[PDB]
Structure 1
Amino acid sequence: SSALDKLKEFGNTLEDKARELISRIKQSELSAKMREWFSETFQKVKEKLKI
């Protein structure tokens, strides 16, 4: 059963890496959306108070 249990460990590492990836994608998305929001808000404040 050597090739089988080797494949089972493989499936489990894959599953864990997929979930890790998803979490990092969402944290990056949160980071990017806050960057864009902050910058846009700043620019609007700039625009409303000239230079």
Structure 2
Amino acid sequence: LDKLKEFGNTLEDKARELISRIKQSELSAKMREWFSETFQKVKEKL
């Protein structure tokens, strides 16, 4: 039963971390496309 509890707390910790790394990638990805879409729009206007 402590072996059972251990297993749950590991699934919850690996779950935390995976979602915490998805948000980071996402943030990182949206800004990058946002910075690039804006630069391309300025080149248009140049």
TM-score, structure 2 length as denominator? 0.91
Q: Per-residue CA shift, 1:1-51, capped at 9, x if unaligned?
A: xxx2112101001001111111101001001101110100100010000xx
Residue segments in structure 1 that go unaligned for 5+ positions in a row: none
- Computing the radius of gyration over CA atoms, which structure comes out larger, 1 or 2? 1
User: What RMSD, in angstroms, separates the aligned Cα atoms of the two structures?
Assistant: 0.7
Runs of 4+ aligned structure 1 residues displaced above 6 Å come to none
Give the Cα–Cα distance (whole angstroms) in 1 for the partners of residues 44 and 4 of structure 2: 59
C-alpha distance in 1 between matches for 2:45 and 2:25: 30
Question: What is the aligned length?
Answer: 46
Structure 2: gaps of 5 or more residues: none
| TM-score relative to the length of structure 1 | 0.83
- Identity rate, percent: 100
